[PDB]
């Protein structure tokens, strides 16, 4: 009988423990593996894949394809804001239900640059230039184009190349940010403006749509595994 | 692969980490480093004890 | 022909001289320096104004009266309106600096007194009313000292600072402030105090308005005193120079 | 000497030079490095005293009860909840606050005890109690009732313990979002210098939830859960003056002005009066 | 005075004699109210045993024109605290002469019958008496303040150590803070 | 060796115990240690904690498992004034938490003397005037031990006894002395009641113990 | 960074400091040292208390008044009641020593005066009444100075000392006392005076009560003077430390 | 690194210290040193058994 001495923790049951345990099926012959397309090794592999962002949460539209449409049309001026949402990949309703956001919501911390790809779905004859911008926190969200261009931005010119990317560089005072909301962990404001208004010819629709895709960059990571707020129940399903 | 250190006295002990995370390891109770200078003596010009501090 | 009493410091288009200083205290032994690539997170190209931002900014003087309890200045803050150093704070989300803090105060072979110049990192302050936290306006004095109180400050649903000197407004022994980079201006032998402070914080960079990582405090332990005849107005002036100032996250100005 | 040994006393004899170890100038901010032999003839002393028990690690490495609440068998409060913090207890908090910034892993230990409540229920026959502690990181669903779906913990970490067994225990990594836990924060949560002020603007360590898994008996039972912290693998920076004034609030440094020390008769009294 | 900067001031002034005591406190880095709340004392109060020499640095904050010499002394226990200068000089002492070098050190050598002393109070572990006297009274010129102050700094030497970790008496509470 | 034991109750007046540490309240171990003038050793501490239900008139009692807490307070540290004093936080004081049913709690203690060896005898005083205390007790400053329950358990009243055992390890002893002859009288000094050298017998020729 | 103005002396458990001394005069060039075997007669094992006896003993201070003529102390004697040095004198027939004599006296840049610290070996003194010889009580002051007189002392069958300063009570020119190890405390530049004296005598050892081989004298040649306002009580303190003290012929105590 | 000693008899056993403090080690029950001289025979001049103690 080898003199032993149990220590605190003994007999407990940690949900995240990691020990060996006897098989209930001694010598069971597992079914041989098989090459199945598209294996997944890390969730970040998924978070690097673009998914369509619902920038237009506005009212009832959340219950239609319109949620994914960004209104753009010919105006009698330029400088007009086209949209504007915060950099809260986890919290903001704009991202929260995205492929990226869904994943973030199973974690507590996030870090890395993010890509916002914008595809112009107007007509071949429609043209124009937009100013995609990212303003780090500290001041308020820019309210005029002339104040947004003072920050990190990309002047996108619509043409044969349908889409254009606004890479939101990870600028932050800490290594990681909270997936949940917190002002310490404030991420800044993402806004779009008209650089040079939409200009179509006759017989070509002057009102268009712009889609927005979001995905993580190669320097993106997530920490502290937690449960999603997005799924609930009252009783075991039957 | 265990390790073998010295106990505190005026002999050794064996240790084998059993967990995959360093966070699970026992405390580092034997780091006897010391560097008072950072606090006592953070002067830019070295002050020689036997000398006058001002001249 | 050499005396450690004499010294001269040059930073940008500004130079300072003393003929009666002590040594020069250097932070926690560390000398200011830019952020290394293996210690950064902010991915954008930082800005290093250098000479334009790392120069000597002379704040408002202050009078040392036979009863003055002491003064204090939050550091990122005390310069937030001085030259381009301030302009960079307003325009950038992130900033990082060290400072050469120089406190001047001459008297004469006939006066007496002993100030305690100290750089307290992370000087969170207490409130007079135990249920609130001091307001910005009560803590920050930007380029104009904030005075400590000769005696307690009363409660009463206000957002005031518990400025009682012997408690340094932190609820600690004022006489234990020495564990922080410091010097003593003892009019008898001294005449100025110089302290070089390296960037301190629990992160590589931080927002300069929302946070004040260091707080300069001057506190007389031995009150000023002279005699009828000797001049009566003995001022204390503070000059601070940023060192290796870097700024990231450029955007529209305003400290909103 | 021996890694942690203390300096030995160097034997000295009569002096009469112009060397002035004893004369210095505190104004420099420099602490004198004088030793006995500098101002008096000393003998030689091989000193074997170690400073082992003064290491930052040995100083902060002892379990400390930082808080405790209770939840009952039945009734109104059937489950407990606690926003994680080391500042509600004064013991450990004063030590950690000996330094401005700190970094360490944490050894968590829980002491769970139950007590039968006075009632008028006949024939009570309690079964062994099984508790469940669960951690909810900032942003996760919270339990609203002892039988909320949240206690599923598919991802949240949680321990299940049964009275009688040794205290449940587990290790926790350095969880800061920054390069070190901050003990003090002379700043705000808003860029306008509004909102919160002080240490609490950085505290976002989530919440802890306890509850029973079974009611056990027909009678009413109250359970107390004591949370202990034990820093491991410690690294501390920028020491500061130890807390002088008693603690007042848990989310800020607010204090009630205190005297520098206890008093005594006159500067000549060798007594503590 | 404990509620003002005055607590840290040591009164010195020109007299019509010499030999006058200037102050006197015991060597109880842990217990004595004089040290107990010091940087050194705060630390000692988290331990049960202490050992080592201690440094008392004295800075003269008079005026440049003020002069004088003091007798800093340490008398090991066994007899009583010296009551006259002529009895204190019979012990370990340093005759400090004020001049350009503002501060002066009185190194209190660790003399003791045991290797360690109790941080708490105990007569077995008695540490002796630290006293100051006027060697040659303060002497200022006209127009220069004749009443001055002397500050006293304390710190441990390189042979100082502490044992048996315990809780401080200096911090208490009645309920978890909210 | 059991060197001492007290009790504390579920509720009432004495809800927590306290004991100024000493090996001289028990006679067994004390007489052995006193076989030598000075001694040096480490100590293996063992605690036997037992509880007993007190007689009362409380209906339907249903005790939960008891959890105790022993805590050591070195000379100079804050003492508990009540079973729920902040002092039982033990951020730094060492203390054990035990639960009835489990093996006796146990722990090792280093040679804690302030000197180069524990002294068993001290023909001296605590004052240089040769006043104050006299004898072994002027050296005893081993602090105090405090026990208490952590939970009350049941509605009924319960009394718990805590037995403290000492076990010297890594012993070194110097200057042997005559074994104690006279019974022990007081715990803090060697006071005795004069005793005969041995039992008697008839005559210097009697081969019998009479 | 070095000044001969500063100095520090350590002997036993005692240290002395000065920031305004002159040099240090060393006896007749000779530095104290124990008795060599080829120079001794006392055959018994001597006793060398060392640290216990060769330490700094600070005597009673004395006031320097605008008219003070001067003071004096017989050396073997001035310490005959101080610590173990005295206890050894009482218990032993024979003793031998040297001393580090340190005379302190600070004033201020505004005072003026000039003392003459001197160690006179074999200072036999004269009597007021030419037919007698001064009494012990009139010569010895043991740890308390003996004053010199501003003017002659009258005769009249008494056993008094002819304390007239300008004659040093020896019937010689007071201004010729310089042929003895000396220093001058000139308040203007000086502040203390240090003199190390080697054992002097016509024999290896002598009885310390029956004989006083050296006599310390402080005598102002330029009287103290200041101005209304400047402090008036300027004391003069004397500290003496035995060096290489040896004692032979142990027996019962008492200076009988 | 364990150790291996001899048990008491008229075989060996293995030991591995598990704690960082020597105080935690088991007792030293096998130190059979002996030196009666200090007590029996503390005479300055050696007394030879077969000889007379006085002459
Ligand atoms: C069942 C899992 C329990 C997990 C326990 C997690 C506790 C987190 C501890 C955070 C530690 C001390 C930090 C103070 C935070 C701050 O002010 O920045
Ligand atoms: C929970 C921690 C308990 C610690 C137990 C500490 C007990 C100290 C034992 C001291 C031992 C015997 C000493 C006699 C002392 C003396 O008379 O000098």
GROMACS .gro file of N, CA, C and O in nm, chain B:
model
  220
  239UNK      N    1   0.986   1.231  -1.764
  239UNK     CA    2   1.093   1.322  -1.727
  239UNK      C    3   1.055   1.412  -1.611
  239UNK      O    4   1.011   1.525  -1.632
  240UNK      N    5   1.093   1.362  -1.493
  240UNK     CA    6   1.095   1.455  -1.380
  240UNK      C    7   1.214   1.550  -1.361
  240UNK      O    8   1.314   1.540  -1.431
  241UNK      N    9   1.200   1.642  -1.266
  241UNK     CA   10   1.303   1.740  -1.232
  241UNK      C   11   1.343   1.714  -1.088
  241UNK      O   12   1.273   1.644  -1.014
  242UNK      N   13   1.456   1.770  -1.046
  242UNK     CA   14   1.503   1.749  -0.910
  242UNK      C   15   1.571   1.873  -0.857
  242UNK      O   16   1.678   1.910  -0.904
  243UNK      N   17   1.510   1.938  -0.759
  243UNK     CA   18   1.568   2.059  -0.703
  243UNK      C   19   1.612   2.042  -0.560
  243UNK      O   20   1.604   1.933  -0.503
  244UNK      N   21   1.658   2.151  -0.503
  244UNK     CA   22   1.704   2.151  -0.366
  244UNK      C   23   1.596   2.207  -0.275
  244UNK      O   24   1.525   2.301  -0.312
  245UNK      N   25   1.583   2.149  -0.157
  245UNK     CA   26   1.485   2.196  -0.062
  245UNK      C   27   1.549   2.310   0.015
  245UNK      O   28   1.666   2.340  -0.004
  246UNK      N   29   1.471   2.374   0.102
  246UNK     CA   30   1.521   2.483   0.184
  246UNK      C   31   1.584   2.422   0.311
  246UNK      O   32   1.527   2.329   0.367
  247UNK      N   33   1.701   2.472   0.354
  247UNK     CA   34   1.773   2.423   0.474
  247UNK      C   35   1.875   2.523   0.535
  247UNK      O   36   1.880   2.638   0.493
  248UNK      N   37   1.956   2.479   0.632
  248UNK     CA   38   2.053   2.568   0.694
  248UNK      C   39   2.200   2.536   0.671
  248UNK      O   40   2.289   2.579   0.748
  249UNK      N   41   1.965   1.843   0.076
  249UNK     CA   42   1.877   1.742   0.019
  249UNK      C   43   1.792   1.797  -0.095
  249UNK      O   44   1.774   1.918  -0.107
  250UNK      N   45   1.740   1.708  -0.179
  250UNK     CA   46   1.660   1.744  -0.295
  250UNK      C   47   1.518   1.690  -0.288
  250UNK      O   48   1.484   1.612  -0.200
  251UNK      N   49   1.436   1.730  -0.385
  251UNK     CA   50   1.299   1.684  -0.395
  251UNK      C   51   1.267   1.665  -0.543
  251UNK      O   52   1.319   1.736  -0.627
  252UNK      N   53   1.181   1.568  -0.574
  252UNK     CA   54   1.145   1.540  -0.713
  252UNK      C   55   1.010   1.602  -0.753
  252UNK      O   56   0.916   1.604  -0.674
  253UNK      N   57   1.000   1.652  -0.876
  253UNK     CA   58   0.876   1.712  -0.926
  253UNK      C   59   0.843   1.670  -1.069
  253UNK      O   60   0.929   1.671  -1.158
  254UNK      N   61   0.717   1.632  -1.092
  254UNK     CA   62   0.672   1.595  -1.225
  254UNK      C   63   0.543   1.672  -1.253
  254UNK      O   64   0.443   1.650  -1.185
  255UNK      N   65   0.544   1.762  -1.350
  255UNK     CA   66   0.423   1.835  -1.382
  255UNK      C   67   0.325   1.739  -1.446
  255UNK      O   68   0.362   1.665  -1.537
  256UNK      N   69   0.200   1.741  -1.400
  256UNK     CA   70   0.099   1.650  -1.453
  256UNK      C   71  -0.002   1.715  -1.547
  256UNK      O   72  -0.083   1.645  -1.606
  257UNK      N   73   0.001   1.848  -1.561
  257UNK     CA   74  -0.098   1.915  -1.645
  257UNK      C   75  -0.044   1.982  -1.770
  257UNK      O   76   0.071   2.025  -1.775
  258UNK      N   77  -0.129   1.994  -1.872
  258UNK     CA   78  -0.088   2.053  -1.999
  258UNK      C   79  -0.072   2.204  -1.999
  258UNK      O   80  -0.028   2.262  -2.099
  259UNK      N   81  -0.107   2.269  -1.889
  259UNK     CA   82  -0.097   2.414  -1.881
  259UNK      C   83   0.000   2.455  -1.771
  259UNK      O   84  -0.007   2.405  -1.659
  260UNK      N   85   0.092   2.546  -1.803
  260UNK     CA   86   0.190   2.589  -1.705
  260UNK      C   87   0.123   2.653  -1.584
  260UNK      O   88   0.180   2.656  -1.473
  261UNK      N   89   0.002   2.706  -1.606
  261UNK     CA   90  -0.074   2.771  -1.501
  261UNK      C   91  -0.099   2.673  -1.386
  261UNK      O   92  -0.110   2.714  -1.270
  262UNK      N   93  -0.106   2.545  -1.419
  262UNK     CA   94  -0.130   2.442  -1.320
  262UNK      C   95  -0.010   2.409  -1.231
  262UNK      O   96  -0.024   2.345  -1.128
  263UNK      N   97   0.109   2.454  -1.270
  263UNK     CA   98   0.227   2.422  -1.189
  263UNK      C   99   0.228   2.488  -1.053
  263UNK      O  100   0.162   2.590  -1.031
  264UNK      N  101   0.304   2.429  -0.961
  264UNK     CA  102   0.317   2.483  -0.827
  264UNK      C  103   0.389   2.617  -0.833
  264UNK      O  104   0.445   2.655  -0.935
  265UNK      N  105   0.387   2.689  -0.722
  265UNK     CA  106   0.449   2.820  -0.715
  265UNK      C  107   0.600   2.820  -0.735
  265UNK      O  108   0.666   2.717  -0.721
  266UNK      N  109   0.652   2.937  -0.769
  266UNK     CA  110   0.794   2.953  -0.790
  266UNK      C  111   0.843   3.018  -0.664
  266UNK      O  112   0.870   3.138  -0.661
  267UNK      N  113   0.854   2.938  -0.558
  267UNK     CA  114   0.896   2.989  -0.429
  267UNK      C  115   1.046   3.002  -0.409
  267UNK      O  116   1.090   3.046  -0.303
  268UNK      N  117   1.126   2.967  -0.509
  268UNK     CA  118   1.270   2.976  -0.488
  268UNK      C  119   1.351   3.075  -0.571
  268UNK      O  120   1.473   3.061  -0.584
  269UNK      N  121   1.284   3.177  -0.624
  269UNK     CA  122   1.351   3.280  -0.704
  269UNK      C  123   1.412   3.384  -0.610
  269UNK      O  124   1.346   3.481  -0.573
  270UNK      N  125   1.538   3.366  -0.576
  270UNK     CA  126   1.603   3.457  -0.484
  270UNK      C  127   1.676   3.576  -0.543
  270UNK      O  128   1.762   3.636  -0.479
  271UNK      N  129   1.640   3.613  -0.666
  271UNK     CA  130   1.702   3.728  -0.730
  271UNK      C  131   1.682   3.852  -0.644
  271UNK      O  132   1.592   3.857  -0.561
  272UNK      N  133   1.767   3.951  -0.663
  272UNK     CA  134   1.759   4.076  -0.589
  272UNK      C  135   1.828   4.186  -0.665
  272UNK      O  136   1.938   4.168  -0.716
  273UNK      N  137   1.762   4.301  -0.674
  273UNK     CA  138   1.818   4.416  -0.742
  273UNK      C  139   1.764   4.545  -0.679
  273UNK      O  140   1.676   4.611  -0.734
  274UNK      N  141   1.818   4.582  -0.563
  274UNK     CA  142   1.774   4.703  -0.494
  274UNK      C  143   1.798   4.832  -0.573
  274UNK      O  144   1.721   4.928  -0.562
  275UNK      N  145   1.904   4.834  -0.653
  275UNK     CA  146   1.938   4.953  -0.731
  275UNK      C  147   1.824   5.031  -0.795
  275UNK      O  148   1.822   5.154  -0.789
  276UNK      N  149   1.731   4.960  -0.859
  276UNK     CA  150   1.616   5.024  -0.925
  276UNK      C  151   1.547   5.125  -0.832
  276UNK      O  152   1.502   5.232  -0.876
  277UNK      N  153   1.542   5.091  -0.704
  277UNK     CA  154   1.477   5.173  -0.603
  277UNK      C  155   1.577   5.253  -0.520
  277UNK      O  156   1.576   5.376  -0.523
  278UNK      N  157   1.662   5.186  -0.446
  278UNK     CA  158   1.762   5.259  -0.370
  278UNK      C  159   1.876   5.285  -0.468
  278UNK      O  160   1.938   5.190  -0.515
  279UNK      N  161   1.902   5.412  -0.501
  279UNK     CA  162   2.009   5.449  -0.596
  279UNK      C  163   1.975   5.469  -0.744
  279UNK      O  164   2.057   5.436  -0.829
  280UNK      N  165   1.856   5.522  -0.778
  280UNK     CA  166   1.826   5.541  -0.920
  280UNK      C  167   1.881   5.673  -0.972
  280UNK      O  168   1.814   5.746  -1.045
  281UNK      N  169   2.004   5.704  -0.933
  281UNK     CA  170   2.070   5.826  -0.975
  281UNK      C  171   2.143   5.803  -1.108
  281UNK      O  172   2.195   5.695  -1.133
  282UNK      N  173   2.147   5.905  -1.192
  282UNK     CA  174   2.213   5.897  -1.323
  282UNK      C  175   2.365   5.895  -1.311
  282UNK      O  176   2.433   5.834  -1.392
  283UNK      N  177   2.418   5.964  -1.211
  283UNK     CA  178   2.562   5.968  -1.191
  283UNK      C  179   2.594   5.887  -1.068
  283UNK      O  180   2.547   5.916  -0.958
  284UNK      N  181   2.674   5.784  -1.086
  284UNK     CA  182   2.710   5.694  -0.978
  284UNK      C  183   2.766   5.766  -0.856
  284UNK      O  184   2.861   5.844  -0.865
  285UNK      N  185   2.707   5.738  -0.741
  285UNK     CA  186   2.751   5.800  -0.618
  285UNK      C  187   2.839   5.706  -0.537
  285UNK      O  188   2.791   5.604  -0.487
  286UNK      N  189   2.966   5.741  -0.524
  286UNK     CA  190   3.060   5.659  -0.449
  286UNK      C  191   3.053   5.682  -0.298
  286UNK      O  192   3.097   5.786  -0.247
  287UNK      N  193   3.000   5.584  -0.227
  287UNK     CA  194   2.983   5.590  -0.082
  287UNK      C  195   3.082   5.677  -0.005
  287UNK      O  196   3.041   5.773   0.063
  288UNK      N  197   3.211   5.646  -0.013
  288UNK     CA  198   3.314   5.720   0.061
  288UNK      C  199   3.331   5.867   0.021
  288UNK      O  200   3.394   5.945   0.093
  289UNK      N  201   3.275   5.904  -0.092
  289UNK     CA  202   3.286   6.042  -0.138
  289UNK      C  203   3.174   6.133  -0.088
  289UNK      O  204   3.076   6.088  -0.026
  290UNK      N  205   3.191   6.263  -0.112
  290UNK     CA  206   3.090   6.361  -0.071
  290UNK      C  207   2.983   6.357  -0.181
  290UNK      O  208   3.017   6.344  -0.298
  291UNK      N  209   2.856   6.365  -0.144
  291UNK     CA  210   2.749   6.361  -0.243
  291UNK      C  211   2.742   6.490  -0.326
  291UNK      O  212   2.683   6.491  -0.433
  292UNK      N  213   2.802   6.596  -0.274
  292UNK     CA  214   2.805   6.726  -0.342
  292UNK      C  215   2.941   6.789  -0.319
  292UNK      O  216   3.004   6.767  -0.215
  293UNK      N  217   2.987   6.869  -0.415
  293UNK     CA  218   3.117   6.935  -0.403
  293UNK      C  219   3.121   7.070  -0.474
  293UNK      O  220   3.115   7.071  -0.600
   0.00000   0.00000   0.00000
